[PDB]
Amino acid sequence: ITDSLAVVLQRRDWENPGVTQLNRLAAHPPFASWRNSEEARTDRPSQQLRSLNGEWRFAWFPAPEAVPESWLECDLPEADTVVVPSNWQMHGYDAPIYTVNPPFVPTENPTGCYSLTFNVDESWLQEGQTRIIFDGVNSAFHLWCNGRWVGYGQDSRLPSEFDLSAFLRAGENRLAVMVLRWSDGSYLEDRMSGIFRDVSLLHKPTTQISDFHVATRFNDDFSRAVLEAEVQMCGELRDYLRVTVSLWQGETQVASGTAPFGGEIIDERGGYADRVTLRLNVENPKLWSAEIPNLYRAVVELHTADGTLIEAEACDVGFREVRIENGLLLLNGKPLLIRGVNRHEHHPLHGQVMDEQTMVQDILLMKQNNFNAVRCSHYPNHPLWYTLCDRYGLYVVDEANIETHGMVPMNRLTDDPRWLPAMSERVTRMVQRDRNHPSVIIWSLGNESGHGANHDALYRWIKSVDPSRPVQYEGGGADTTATDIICPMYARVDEDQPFPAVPKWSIKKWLSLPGETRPLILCEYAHAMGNSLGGFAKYWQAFRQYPRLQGGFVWDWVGLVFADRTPHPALTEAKHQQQFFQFRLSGQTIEVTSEYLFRHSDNELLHWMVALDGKPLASGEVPLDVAPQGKQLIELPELPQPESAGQLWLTVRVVQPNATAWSEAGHISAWQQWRLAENLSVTLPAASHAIPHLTTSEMDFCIELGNKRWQFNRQSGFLSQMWIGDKKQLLTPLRDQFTRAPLDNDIGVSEATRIDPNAWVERWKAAGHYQAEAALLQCTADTLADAVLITTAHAWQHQGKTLFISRKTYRIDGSGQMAITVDVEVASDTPHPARIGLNCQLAQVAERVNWLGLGPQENYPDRLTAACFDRWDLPLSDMYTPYVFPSENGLRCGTRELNYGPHQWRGDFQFNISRYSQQQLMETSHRHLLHAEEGTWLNIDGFHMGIGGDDSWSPSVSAEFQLSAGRYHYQLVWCQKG
């Protein structure tokens, strides 16, 4: 018959861009079909919305032409039971991976056959309309109900609704869903097939609310608002039908309106008889923002003239105005600063199935790290996400599910009018679904699809239908006519990237180009792959200095956190750079500037502390009373002035004494540190009575002082062994190190098969930095009046070229201390080294690492503003960052003192300490393959290269963070317990 798979799978609707759906209902805001208005007001669950999530029968087939006809009537015997909201590649049916003919898809199209057997009660079948809703099905699908074909759907990321009234019988019914892995829609979504979102049954009355959308208008000072609500009905029009729209703040009704159906005259033929526009006046409305997410409840009742209710719908309403004025994006008349992050829908252990608790955890983490905006990365999200962003407060950019980055002209589809219908569906249905949410402030036309005329047409469509929101689009150079905002991807603060026909100007230069008036917000910046986010403070200095630089979205929230939502160290950096209080020090006065636009600092307390080399001396706490965008002066008490040598540090932090909806009591939101005053140590070490004794064989230099011994290998010139009593302290000799295990930013997109030679790791490998051999040049050993002096000279050579020369002096005096001075010259023509330091493997393993230096968390020369100077004590495992792909990690900069076991190192250095060598980190592909080595590897660097982070496919370490000086000096004193 006509419902057999032979007839249905004959036109190949999945290989036709002109067919994106069959028998699919219109798009609309989410509906519950409440039959009592009190349940709609309180958002209570509706008896008319029945979830079909749960156990479904599933079968897998290589191609759609391999499914038996009997599947249409009876479930297959070998079918496996699954939970329908899921991806079938989470169960071992076909292999998904991360990674040609625009209309055609491969003939071997993996096919999932879902089926459900369910009861429909008689009341639903007696009257009204029953529909099935698929919140998301990846690629395309065909639907059968009790063996009769219903319809066809595409656009995985938006709901597909089908009228099931004529197909449902009494009692048991069977739904059969054939889901294809690829369709023509895959060319706009350029894996992970299946029914990955919720499946529901909705019952509406015969006459019903078919649509409704709300808008807010304000006077000049936002003290008066008009809420306009347009309501569309479908069904049989009657003269007694009424629509009431009521606005509620809590349990208190603030406005209400009622009217029959029939709108104003639109043109010569009249108006809409099935539509009604109600206008509600709200005096002194509580405005919505991310800082204070004030919400109202709008209840729309379709009833009769006498008063019996037919059906009620409801939504949350936020009174807020978004507009671009004089080149500035304003919310409620104030210039926004977007502390945004890009976020994909990725469950920690369920693929693309997003549940409520994961969303709440993510929102809490983002708000706790000073994010106020989120970008729906390249497709519309679960509808619950927008509700949660309304309720907690987060600016949302809603993005159409259009992504054609694989195209070689890259606008081949988006400049073709034959693809205009498919793109128009993906834009219009998203706008029709999500236009009522106050959190959504910007529409995005999609991601990386070039710039065609379809983009301009859809941009103009959105501007006509919804003028309340700006439209942004990155594509064709991030500044085309299809965007209201210049929205570059990974443009840099100061350095231009003049690519042909799509240059990435520096954002400062981009703002001032001839004729350019628009605000700039980066849709993607600060790529967080691996050990990254160097140079973030430069971006935020630019954001705060330039009015039309209004922020951006950091790429990949999850990423800034691990899959289990464990935070990356760079997240701390972001939290510090995006904090809402800026601090200035002048003498003994702290100026606190609030970066809040709307809220007073009513839950803020300023704690301060003064410390000398990590030892606290004075502290206090001052309540903050700062108006939005205002300033508060805090005069400090007379600060201590110690006579003891050391450096005075003043730390201030902002604490929230009370808990909020998103933070616990005592939450730290902002902080800052200053150097107050330094006293230089002029006290001399008291002269010792003993003198270290030197013994010289041809093999080694041996120095003895009490129970301590130092042995230098004369063949190699390096300190080879150390003895306390009779215990050897070293496993590997202390030797110079100029390389690091490459980071994701060092590697770039360089591949073993496809080498990119501009990458840092490629330049280091070609120069022979990893294969350079140390050759001893001079070695002298002398006894002074009160010490022993060892001097050595080493040259590192590769293929006849000297890359580095290291000259070192070792002074061992009568107190047991060993001072090491290192002077290194680097050839100007070799690539700048990743580091200049010393490396050794300590024989003993200790539980704790103590250090007077910067920060508790890993910090680097170009990512260290969020670290504070103090005395830190951590477990050894806390000194290693478990990046998925192993690399150099765990460095602590600005370190004056390091204590590990019985060993102390003093000076001015960076260090990392771990159980993994740089060699093992380089040669291990995944972090689970790492194995702890016998002792502790210590890397003490005098100098270290920046890590970059602007992007991960080109060098991004700024010149001020490269080791280009050519000559380098450092000193470190090594002592033991005594």
Next chain:
Amino acid sequence: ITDSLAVVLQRRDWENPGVTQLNRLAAHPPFASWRNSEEARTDRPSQQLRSLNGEWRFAWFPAPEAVPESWLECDLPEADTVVVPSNWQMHGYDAPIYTVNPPFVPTENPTGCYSLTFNVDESWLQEGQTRIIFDGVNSAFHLWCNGRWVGYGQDSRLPSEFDLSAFLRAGENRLAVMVLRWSDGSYLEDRMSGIFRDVSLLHKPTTQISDFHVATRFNDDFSRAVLEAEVQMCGELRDYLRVTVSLWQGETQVASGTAPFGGEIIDERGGYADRVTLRLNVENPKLWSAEIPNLYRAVVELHTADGTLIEAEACDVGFREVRIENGLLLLNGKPLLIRGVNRHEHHPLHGQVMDEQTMVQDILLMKQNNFNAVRCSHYPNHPLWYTLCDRYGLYVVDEANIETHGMVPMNRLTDDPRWLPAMSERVTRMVQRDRNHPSVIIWSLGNESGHGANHDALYRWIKSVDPSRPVQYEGGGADTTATDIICPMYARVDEDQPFPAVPKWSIKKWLSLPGETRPLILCEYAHAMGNSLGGFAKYWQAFRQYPRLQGGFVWDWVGLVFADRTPHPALTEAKHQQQFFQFRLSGQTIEVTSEYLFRHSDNELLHWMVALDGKPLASGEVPLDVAPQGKQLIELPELPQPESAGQLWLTVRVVQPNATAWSEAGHISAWQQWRLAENLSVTLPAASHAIPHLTTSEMDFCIELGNKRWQFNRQSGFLSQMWIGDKKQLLTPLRDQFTRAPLDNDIGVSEATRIDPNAWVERWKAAGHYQAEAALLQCTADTLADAVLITTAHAWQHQGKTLFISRKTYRIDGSGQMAITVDVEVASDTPHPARIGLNCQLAQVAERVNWLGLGPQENYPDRLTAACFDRWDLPLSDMYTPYVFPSENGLRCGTRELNYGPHQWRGDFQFNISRYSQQQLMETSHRHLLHAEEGTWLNIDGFHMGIGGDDSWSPSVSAEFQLSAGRYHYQLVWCQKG
């Protein structure tokens, strides 16, 4: 199987707005696939383009579900042979007439089943691609080739192409076309189904030119041009493929360019490898316009690197620039004045099948009547029409086939995103087909569809794809954001029509509204239904006075001409109002201003003539040498100054001594007449010796003078009979007439079932003008010294109210002359009468009508500027205008003398003379039902109402042309041969 009608007619693609085609090829400019470039250059017929027009088998079925399956393989036995380019309602299968559920169409859908059996030669099947082209199929159709389903098509007014390569066999093949009368596309085309355009087979090579479009760029003074030609290939790309674009003026090549494939970089992924853009420099190009349609020939050759040609295409190229600047529409830098007309595709006797000769005849007639622009009324035309407009010179507005005027919100579909794909197809495919034509200067988004967001989206699409042409759209008030031109329908010169939400301002007021900067061109004005076009001169006075009033398109070319292309009298008016030479008189000097923008008057000769009461006295001829938009002064020779009584008239006309492509030698293009000087007649009639003798019975007054007798009925008061010798001269008594047979403008849209009371005919009927009865009040008869005086008074009364009073004097002197003075008073509260005159039925029928008065053609008080004062002699049949719906017709205004048979009437009057009474014209629905009456009906009016013409659904007669004075006087002398 899957090709059976059961499977194919199951998804009901004709009831789904989301399916407008299946397996349809892309849109492109017309292709011939020439295999030798010399044939492409000379536009010789191509052997690769084979017409399938001719004899086809046809069957008719009530519904698509009534067609037998056997039709798919064998032709039906009862099938009738027809010519395929035709409408099947021209053969009696279902009834077409002139005159609910947006997706659904009636289930009783009349279905035409066409079939063709044809030979395909082996060479086409060996290699290459063979496609079938349907230039037009009304509504929707399904296609089968040799029993296998090919595809589905909609959008009747654009070609549908299908690849037939896999379906064609050797020798005989059968095509089966199922054409439905209605589809969802009918909601955008709101009859006359069938295959009404040409059907062709096109053979292209395996690698082929798939697209090409040309653009012209100019410097500031148009002395240098760059022709940019973008060429798109489809097929297998090779490194030796080359594209050559050559430009030819006649047989002389002016430019040429060659390049391999591969365009410039468009974005990060590169450019188009299958596209090439060639730039050609043309120095001092001959510019295209309607006045001088200079054309070049562009030949595009796809060949190899060695030189063998693969395939050639060609087009005509016009170098011209269209832009809107400072609110003015400029062509080649000059402000256009659009002398336009709306033209439907309507064959005189073949329905909607348009052939070449009809197009050429229409273009010649339009150019001969001073039209320079044509509007494709509501759909794209036959592709040959645009070529003919390129070659002869006519500005063309190309309109999308979108028309939803039946919708009750009237933007219900065009504001719905679910209808955006269907509308986008109709716009994009038209632009893709017609963008290379120089005649097309404006894109139109459609007709009467309200204003939705789809209109804005498609407007922006056109502006992105083709910035070389302005986009206009009437809908939602004719001044929305979806139009570059204010393009009202039937807006008036001075009177506003403030409708709710779509006001029709006066065009003068519309121009100056706050914030309005755009030019105004009426897409429809001067409705020409029936006896119409009154007030046209007001429109053209406004056009010439106001710079931003740049003309308009007169509604319905065919209409301004009858179906057989016989011209309406108002066409003359249009020709006079749109003439390109304006004339001013000052003393004896004529100032001639040229309205041409580009051409010198090199084929123009000014003839002049001076006449006294139609008797010529002096004439001459002066060559015209006028620069574009310049002036020429012509001093007249010493004009005659007669002493004889009469009025001197100066007539000038512009003659084209040489023939053109569109006009014959001696063509008259412009003319003008002035009154020079009048001499009043002060000579007295010599006193007569005889005196008319009066005899008075109670029944009548009888007056005798020689052989002449006049008899007045004393019961009625009217002159009842006249005798010359013994022959009665009258059949109906000479009586006052205040009514006329209503015109289409008098009736409006008033209907017998649906009466519109504001219409003029309704107001006259309600007032009793047609039923008013004359009642004699006074009647006196006296004998003077040398005459007889009859005085009568009549009152016209209806339901107790006196509407008109007529007082008349009759003076019969000794020369046989009868002077009649008429004084009429009209009640101020009755509607103003259509006329005030006398009416009689003359007993004799004469061959000719002679008159000293205005014009040879029918002219009216508000349509008479094109009539000239002279002595005119016409046959009686020339005095009747055969309007399809009979009405008042044939009036000649400004008439001083009228001669008919032996009768002469002198004075200052209007008249019409015919064989049909006003009563018969009123009571006859169609002109073929009219029958000539016994004698001649003469209507001599002292005063006549204007006819209107601004529209035909509301009163449009201006107040200066209504008979509102309340009192009226006229005089007429009636004499006979003597």
